[PDB]
Amino acid sequence: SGFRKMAFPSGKVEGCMVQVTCGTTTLNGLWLDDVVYCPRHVICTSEDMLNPNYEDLLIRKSNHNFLVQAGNVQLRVIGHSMQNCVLKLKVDTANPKTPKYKFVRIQPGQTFSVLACYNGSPSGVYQCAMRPNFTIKGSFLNGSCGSVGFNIDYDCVSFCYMHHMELPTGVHAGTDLEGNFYGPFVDRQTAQAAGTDTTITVNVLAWLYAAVINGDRWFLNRFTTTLNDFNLVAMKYNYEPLTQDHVDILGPLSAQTGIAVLDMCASLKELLQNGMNGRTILGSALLEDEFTPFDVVRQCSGVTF
Amino acid sequence: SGFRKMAFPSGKVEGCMVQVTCGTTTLNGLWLDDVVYCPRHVICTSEDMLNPNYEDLLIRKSNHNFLVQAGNVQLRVIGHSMQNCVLKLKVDTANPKTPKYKFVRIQPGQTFSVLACYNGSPSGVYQCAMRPNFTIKGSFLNGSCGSVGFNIDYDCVSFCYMHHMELPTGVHAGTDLEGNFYGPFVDRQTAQAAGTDTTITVNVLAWLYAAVINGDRWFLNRFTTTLNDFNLVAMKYNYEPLTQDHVDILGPLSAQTGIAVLDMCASLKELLQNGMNGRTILGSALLEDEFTPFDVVRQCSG
Numbered sequence: 001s002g003f004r005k006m007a008f009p010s011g012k013v014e015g016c017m018v019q020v021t022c023g024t025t026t027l028n029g030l031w032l033d034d035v036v037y038c039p040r041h042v043i044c045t046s047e048d049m050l051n052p053n054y055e056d057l058l059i060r061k062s063n064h065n066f067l068v069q070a071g072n073v074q075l076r077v078i079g080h081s082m083q084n085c086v087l088k089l090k091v092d093t094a095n096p097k098t099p100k101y102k103f104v105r106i107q108p109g110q111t112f113s114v115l116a117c118y119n120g121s122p123s124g125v126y127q128c129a130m131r132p133n134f135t136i137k138g139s140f141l142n143g144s145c146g147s148v149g150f151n152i153d154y155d156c157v158s159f160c161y162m163h164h165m166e167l168p169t170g171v172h173a174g175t176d177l178e179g180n181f182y183g184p185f186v187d188r189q190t191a192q193a194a195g196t197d198t199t200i201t202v203n204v205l206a207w208l209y210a211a212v213i214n215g216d217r218w219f220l221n222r223f224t225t226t227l228n229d230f231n232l233v234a235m236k237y238n239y240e241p242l243t244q245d246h247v248d249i250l251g252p253l254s255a256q257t258g259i260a261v262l263d264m265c266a267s268l269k270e271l272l273q274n275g276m277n278g279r280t281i282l283g284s285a286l287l288e289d290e291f292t293p294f295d296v297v298r299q300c301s302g303v304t305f
Numbered sequence: 306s307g308f309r310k311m312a313f314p315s316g317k318v319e320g321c322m323v324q325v326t327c328g329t330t331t332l333n334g335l336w337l338d339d340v341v342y343c344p345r346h347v348i349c350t351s352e353d354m355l356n357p358n359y360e361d362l363l364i365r366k367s368n369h370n371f372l373v374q375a376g377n378v379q380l381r382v383i384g385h386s387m388q389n390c391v392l393k394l395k396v397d398t399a400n401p402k403t404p405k406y407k408f409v410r411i412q413p414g415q416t417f418s419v420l421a422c423y424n425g426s427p428s429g430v431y432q433c434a435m436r437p438n439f440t441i442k443g444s445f446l447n448g449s450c451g452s453v454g455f456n457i458d459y460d461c462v463s464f465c466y467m468h469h470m471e472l473p474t475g476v477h478a479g480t481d482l483e484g485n486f487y488g489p490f491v492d493r494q495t496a497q498a499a500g501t502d503t504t505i506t507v508n509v510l511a512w513l514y515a516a517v518i519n520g521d522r523w524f525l526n527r528f529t530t531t532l533n534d535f536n537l538v539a540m541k542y543n544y545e546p547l548t549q550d551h552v553d554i555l556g557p558l559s560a561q562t563g564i565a566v567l568d569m570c571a572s573l574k575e576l577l578q579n580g581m582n583g584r585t586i587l588g589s590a591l592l593e594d595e596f597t598p599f600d601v602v603r604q605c606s607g
């Protein structure tokens with residue numbers, strides 16, 4: 001049947017993307033009801049990008065300094081406010097394409113779909129995971145800020161990420177839709193480095209289950225471990241700890257495949273200590289950690305939206 | 306910066322996906338204007354899935370044998386005709402969400418986004434390429450037929466694939482939107498084997514250039530090669546031969562990075578000869594062949 005890196009359908013989010021311009025700076029905004037959300041650094045100027053006083057910059061600004069364009073129609077800004085690192089521009093027209101939505105904050109290891117946009121126009125969609133160091137290994141060029149990450153739960157779009165900046169290593173940092181950053185980063189153009197990253201162990205296990213569901217079984221072995229032994233091995237290899245909750249969440253996959261979670265942990269421990277021996281798993285020579293247990297179940301059961 | 310496997314936004318295609326039911330068979334349809342396109346095997350009976358005479362089967366059908374459901378509303382089928390392996394159900398309502406679109410047949414090596422759907426509703430979007438053996442390495446379950454592959458230029462959707470079947474290897478086969486199968490496959494449940502799958506060499510080279518654009522350097526070397534010497538080595542690794550057409554296409558990436566095409570070809574030969582030695586390229590331990598030169602330019606540049 002096959003297994004692919006798959007993003008949620010992006011149609012609901014596409015109808016909310018607009019272009020936000022504060023003079024020279026142009027980026028994307030998320031138009032929900034009568035409010036447009038965008039990074040607050042759009043008001044920054046090259047005079048002081050190093051240490052911007054955002055509260056005082058916004059005081060100088062009036063509604064007329066913000067140009068919002070939805071397609072080929074200009075949206076009238078009738079108010080503006082700042083919440084954390086997101087600017088909220090109130091517009092005179094509610095978005096007729098507003099879907100059932102909610103703002104959520106995700107945890108490290110959870111995945112989401114990113115709709116990369118430029119000049120308010122969606123250009124691509126891809127699936128990524130919030131890394132344990134709170135960055136995302138995205139793909140973003142100039143003008144991509146305001147692009148959002150999201151999941152879909154039943155009929156409801158869950159907005160979880162808005163893109164703000166790129167770190168010197170090529171990884172990306174952003175905030176939730178309340179403007180609070182993921183990770184210890186600030187929206188200033190100064191030297192900032194992401195912490196050492198680690199592998200999302202629970203996601204690796206779920207991906208191994210996806211392989212077993214697809215007939216890839218060479219890595220299974222007779223052995224089992226307990227959570228204590230595996231966690232000691234995992235930390236030695238820069239792998240995140242596996243909690244009892246992670247075992248519970250992997251439960252349905254364990255029942256489906258006949259491979260207990262600690263049974264699979266024995267396979268993963270051998271893979272870490274001995275390598276792939278030239279073999280591949282689902283066409284990959286590395287252990288994929290950007291599939292949650294829910295992603296694997298959803299793709300192997302055909303959940304739609 | 307950063308390089309990701311990236312699909313086109315699927316919204317323009319979501320507005321066209323519908324559910325098509327004939328008898329006890331349900332799959333997906335593509336609703337463009339007043340026509341719904343779906344695989345013609347939706348009318349195939351369980352009695353004879355080996356040698357179905359689809360033309361004979363469709364003559365015995367009436368418009369009332371086809372149920373089309375768009376959202377919560379039922380469309381009325383007012384006509385039906387067959388073009389190759391695709392069934393065309395005319396409906397009484399034109400889709401108000403029909404986008405600017407065209408039908409294109411693609412060549413091996415070309416990439417496109419797939420909107421996997423079930424019961425007429427979008428489930429997910431992913432990227433894949435037409436393999437050299439004319440299959441695709443997709444992700445499909447029961448009831449996924451009718452799902453389409455597409456690309457988007459500006460605001461125009463190029464529909465290039467419709468899913469029809471899964472081969473015993475687990476790879477997938479389908480047609481263009483005019484119903485013509487890619488490769489030597491038929492929409493019958495008969496013994497069918499795909500050819501040996503090979504690597505899309507031009508796509509690998511474009512991906513190496515993408516790595517260089519994104520700061521990777523470790524695989525570069527001082528060597529170069531002739532085109533024929535590169536092909537002789539590469540074919541021993543089940544890599545597709547590289548033509549002068551591929552060399553020309555890689556020209557813009559070559560100029561941007563300052564690395565000649567045959568220079569990069571020498572790097573590829575080294576990677577095939579040596580492996581990775583614990584290193585990765587763009588976060589991957591294998592060479593990736595599902596980014597075209599067009600994909601690389603679009604993602605890396607404006």
Ligand SMILES: *C(#N)[C]([C][C]1[C][C][N]C1=O)[N]C(=O)[C]1[C][Si]([C])([C])[C]N1C(=O)[C]([N]C(=O)O[C])C([C])([C])[C]
Nearest residue numbers: 140141142143144145165166167187188189190192
């Ligand atoms: C938006 N639009 C852009 C997108 C960036 C640039 C290329 N790739 C991306 O992801 N983001 C920015 O302009 C932000 C706003 Si700022 C706090 C005035 C600077 N900035 C940055 O991304 C900068 N990086 C940084 O300071 O991280 C420590 C760079 C990339 C411009 C140096």
Ligand SMILES: *C(#N)[C]([C][C]1[C][C][N]C1=O)[N]C(=O)[C]1[C][Si]([C])([C])[C]N1C(=O)[C]([N]C(=O)O[C])C([C])([C])[C]
Nearest residue numbers: 445446447448449450469470471472492493494497
């Ligand atoms: C549609 N809907 C399905 C989706 C398939 C089945 C599981 N994974 C997929 O991608 N497609 C089919 O049922 C087709 C139509 Si048919 C000519 C009546 C049989 N078929 C098949 O995929 C079959 N394979 C085959 O005949 O290859 C020669 C199997 C997989 C159902 C035996």
Ligand SMILES: [Cl-]
Nearest residue numbers: 052053054055
């Ligand atoms: Cl401040």
Ligand SMILES: [Cl-]
Nearest residue numbers: 080081082083
């Ligand atoms: Cl305020």
Ligand SMILES: [Cl-]
Nearest residue numbers: 005006126127
């Ligand atoms: Cl993807």
Ligand SMILES: [Cl-]
Nearest residue numbers: 141142143144
């Ligand atoms: Cl920018």
Ligand SMILES: [Cl-]
Nearest residue numbers: 220221222223
């Ligand atoms: Cl064993």
Ligand SMILES: [Cl-]
Nearest residue numbers: 109202292293
């Ligand atoms: Cl999880």
Ligand SMILES: [Cl-]
Nearest residue numbers: 249252293297
């Ligand atoms: Cl689950």
Ligand SMILES: [Cl-]
Nearest residue numbers: 124311312313
């Ligand atoms: Cl793309």
Ligand SMILES: [Cl-]
Nearest residue numbers: 388389390484
């Ligand atoms: Cl035919």
